[PDB]
Write a protein that binds this ligand. Sequence first.
Ligand SMILES: Nc1ncnc2c1ncn2[C@@H]1O[C@H](COP(=O)(O)OP(=O)(O)OP(=O)(O)O)[C@@H](O)[C@H]1O
Ligand SMILES: Nc1ncnc2c1ncn2[C@@H]1O[C@H](COP(=O)(O)OP(=O)(O)O)[C@@H](O)[C@H]1O
Ligand SMILES: [Mg+2]
Ligand SMILES: [Mg+2]
Lengths: 71, 421, 542, 105, 50
Amino acid sequence: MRYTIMVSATASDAAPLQFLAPYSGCAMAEYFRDTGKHGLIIYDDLSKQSVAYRQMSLLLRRPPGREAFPG
Amino acid sequence: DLVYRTGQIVNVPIGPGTLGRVTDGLGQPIDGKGPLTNVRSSLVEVKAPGIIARQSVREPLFTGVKAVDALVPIGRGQRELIIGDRQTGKTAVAIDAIIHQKNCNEQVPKAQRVYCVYVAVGQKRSTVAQLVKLFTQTGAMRYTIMVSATASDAAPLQFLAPYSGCAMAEYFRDTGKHGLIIYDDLSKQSVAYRQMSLLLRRPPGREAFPGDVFYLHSRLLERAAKLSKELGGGSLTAFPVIETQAGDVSAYIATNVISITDGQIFLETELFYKGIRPALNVGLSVSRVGSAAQFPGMKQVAGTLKLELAQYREVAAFAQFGSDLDAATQYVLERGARLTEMLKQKQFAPIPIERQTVAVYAATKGFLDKVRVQDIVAAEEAVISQVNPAVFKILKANGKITPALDAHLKAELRKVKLPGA
Amino acid sequence: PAIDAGYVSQVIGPVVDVRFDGELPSILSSLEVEGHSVRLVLEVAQHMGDNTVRCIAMDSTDGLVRGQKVVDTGSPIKVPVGRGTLGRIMNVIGEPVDEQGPIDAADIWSIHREAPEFTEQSTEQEILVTGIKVVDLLAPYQRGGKIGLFGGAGVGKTVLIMELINNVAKAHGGFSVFAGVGERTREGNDLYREMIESGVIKLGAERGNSKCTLVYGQMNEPPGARARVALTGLTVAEYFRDIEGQDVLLFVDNIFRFTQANSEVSALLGRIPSAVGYQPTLATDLGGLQERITTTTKGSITSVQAVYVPADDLTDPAPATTFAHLDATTVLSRSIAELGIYPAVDPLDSTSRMLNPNVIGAEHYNVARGVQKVLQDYKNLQDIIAILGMDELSEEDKLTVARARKIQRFLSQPFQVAEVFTGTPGKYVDLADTISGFQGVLTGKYDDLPEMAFYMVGDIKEVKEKADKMAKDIASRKEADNKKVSEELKDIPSLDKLVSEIKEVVIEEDDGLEEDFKAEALSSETVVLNEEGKSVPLPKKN
Amino acid sequence: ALTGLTVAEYFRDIEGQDVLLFVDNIFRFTQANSEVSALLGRIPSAVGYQPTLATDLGGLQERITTTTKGSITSVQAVYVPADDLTDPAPATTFAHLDATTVLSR
Amino acid sequence: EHASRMSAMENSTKSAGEMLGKLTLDYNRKRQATITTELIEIIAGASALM
Ligand SMILES: Nc1ncnc2c1ncn2[C@@H]1O[C@H](COP(=O)(O)OP(=O)(O)OP(=O)(O)O)[C@@H](O)[C@H]1O
Ligand SMILES: Nc1ncnc2c1ncn2[C@@H]1O[C@H](COP(=O)(O)OP(=O)(O)O)[C@@H](O)[C@H]1O
Ligand SMILES: [Mg+2]
Ligand SMILES: [Mg+2]
């Protein structure tokens, strides 16, 4: 945990906090890339982030496509 | 055009003015015997009775066919689904129950009588007219009530008609009587709800049914139950019928209603088209309410039948075909080939509970093993005719076979006119 | 009082709209309608413009007119909760149905709270014995773990969760809260019988000593209740978690109907549907239900969920997002139950978090990974054995194939609540009974015992005695002969005097259904209403 | 198909003769309903058929019955779509056919 | 050797014949579930734009 950051969007939170959590997860790790170090990132359950994307659009009157995922 | 609200929630006429009449799914009878006279009109959309207004299932409900009363027991207030493919005996078993309920109504008192309700969904008007003609000539017309929404009528009539039949049988549930309702071909009632919901542009789910097709079959089937004795102690036994498609249980309607009813009655087409009619597949078909609430004594003698028909199907169909033969289990197979053809029956002739127990006695204890398998179905009808009619009068009376009776019964079963042998 | 007193704008089935004049209430707050035959409650969820909100009706909507006065509590839906509820049956609003008067409400908590955070979370893994050999070996239940029992409409997710209660809910120190969500109404009643006669529901003056609180939203209700009953019985857990501090037992039955009750109303809310027909919000709503079922650091919840897969198709999204919401997956399959092997737990997918060699130790991990090895050997060789027979492989794996049929029969186990419809009584098996019993079958310590000797047995004591019974029965084929002579004078009157010793029921004709009957006046033309509303016949124009 | 029924319904119900009838290619009549009822903006059913399948296919069948005045029998040529007897078009078709005569090469 | 195989390949033709029997029905019940799940994307694709 000394050398570990963890952004943790639960399933009991709203959709866009899960939608942004890999996006904010790489916002931390671009700093480790920008200042010469090496960075590890794990975007765990990235399909479930895409379901967190599918929730927002289908309430947002946006057209669906394959498996009702957006364009 | 001018619409007119009535001021009453959607209704259907209920009562003894409907006994012996074929009604539409709303209330206008089409038998030609004029409008209803001794009737009252209640709601067709009633909340199903709560838990504390209910009790357990205790009194058995017989059915009259050897295949069903032996291995898949049914109690009053228990809803047992019939399931199978087209032209495989689902409707035949259901009207054999209705004929069987007629004659048993001529041997029970008034407070234990039964009243039949046979709805009809999506069948041809040609064949359902042959059903009410057959119900007249068997005398079950006196205690049947018919709802026939055929394939011609519009989609909310085929959507409402099983609700109307349950409201017509709601009466006997309320005022202390006992009911038997047959939901016929409830898979076609699902497409009726599919029609009335898709044309309202409601977005459909798996296999294009709408989302609430479970709650439709729920509220239809949860209204048939067994009540406590505080509200007259009445009961209602349902028989939904679901048409499956070529050995599929994972159709969306078929797996829906099975998770509602108390058990299924599988009718496998493999057992049918070799001639075994009815084709009750005894190993897939359970009923987990009537096991305690069966006719006792039958449970003492068909428990051996259930354990052998547990093991008879296991060695079937490859005793000589598949791998090889061992001849150590020819004892179960050449006894089980008797017991499968023992469950056969010719059509439109129910066998009561007192005449099935001696029938299931005769093939179990070893009395009919010497007659070869090509003529046992004449042996069993001979056993009904050969043994003197005292024993049928005793076993229905006491309700349980005592040791003072079977020793008399074991002596009688040997001196029968065997076929062949 | 025309401020904050609205009327019904529009009714679409179980979904209604209330237009408000004074001020629209906050989301997930209740409404109370006036003038209905039932005390019907609404719950606001979307403020749909026009000073009008979006509701889902918790009861029957037949009879709503577009002018009826609708008042709010100014609060979310509160349920009477507390120790006095132990032995009561509540529906979604918590009015009693068990006819024992009202409920002595210790407190009235709202059904809509925030889920507990990371700071309140506990990582203390321990084991839960059940009396099942398939559970306590292949995926042992955590003492503070969420439990899933995926069943395919008739494979025994009602019996196994009723067998589990009849084993551990009596011996566990804390209460139970049973939340029947969309189960058949009769099977709630047999749970009401079984808990009285086993001393878990005590009526009269002894209510506070009982060990079970019932919550029932069975499938008779329109889908407001089934959308919210699994939340209400969870709030019976919240008062027993944060306040009481005890270890509650939450056996939520058929939690799929929660996901389907939202699926009934979200087709009416104008929402563009998701994949195969569910709402878009099943990701958060199943999250908003599952993640209150968490063991806090001030008390746990030892809960079992039951997720009904729709059509024996586990790639459906309603169990697919439910795998991750569960510690111990226990999948019940359909095809295995066709052989009669009860319970038909899929051994090769039922995975727990407790299956880990550093918590239960490598004595148990080596046992389960051997069983899951040879079944995966066996399931790899199902394709050859069906089309070419067994007689083609070497003797290095045809030993393992018969070894598979041994351990497939041994997973069968009778259940102590299934004794009503099976005859045999169930067996209560300890943890050390199984792992000792399962070690030797892996090595082949009982290979000379036949494959039917493992069927429906409890312990490793019962594996040889039934194998002795099968052998003993063969010599009972020609052991002795029975004959019963000199009995016809002992206790039997006759056969003909058997006829005269029966009391005859006097069957009465003229059943006469006119008793307790009303038979109102029903004429030819239907009654209509004119413009003033008087019951006149329909005027003769078509 | 309704025209062939009503020139049969004149001979069934006035002359009193037992008329024959051939509603040829009943898969095509089902599919002719599948294109006319998808054209009117109705929401599609299962596999691509109309949602008014059972009601409007039955509306042809339910006027071919017998009566006291006469009887009309139909010989509906059926093409099984994609050689599947669980397709929804023969599924409701074989809920009215009383005799099923196969013709083999 | 050639005789028992002549009856072992007979039953193997039946057994690998009945596994073709269920599997075409496993082809059909997935195909009609495929087109319908492919169809309702279009209705969900069309109703949002009307
Ligand atoms: N015990 C029996 N003896 C002889 N024939 C039988 C028996 N039981 C069923 N059959 C035959 O099987 C058919 C059963 O008809 P039934 O209406 O039950 O089939 P179905 O699957 O319900 O068809 P549908 O759903 O179209 O009514 C009858 O035509 C009858 O000829
Ligand atoms: N331990 C068992 N022994 C024998 N049969 C069982 C056992 N457990 C389940 N079953 C069978 O599985 C069926 C499951 O029915 P039920 O549990 O009510 O439906 P679901 O599985 O959808 O909850 C029962 O009919 C019963 O016959
Ligand atoms: Mg039928
Ligand atoms: Mg279930």
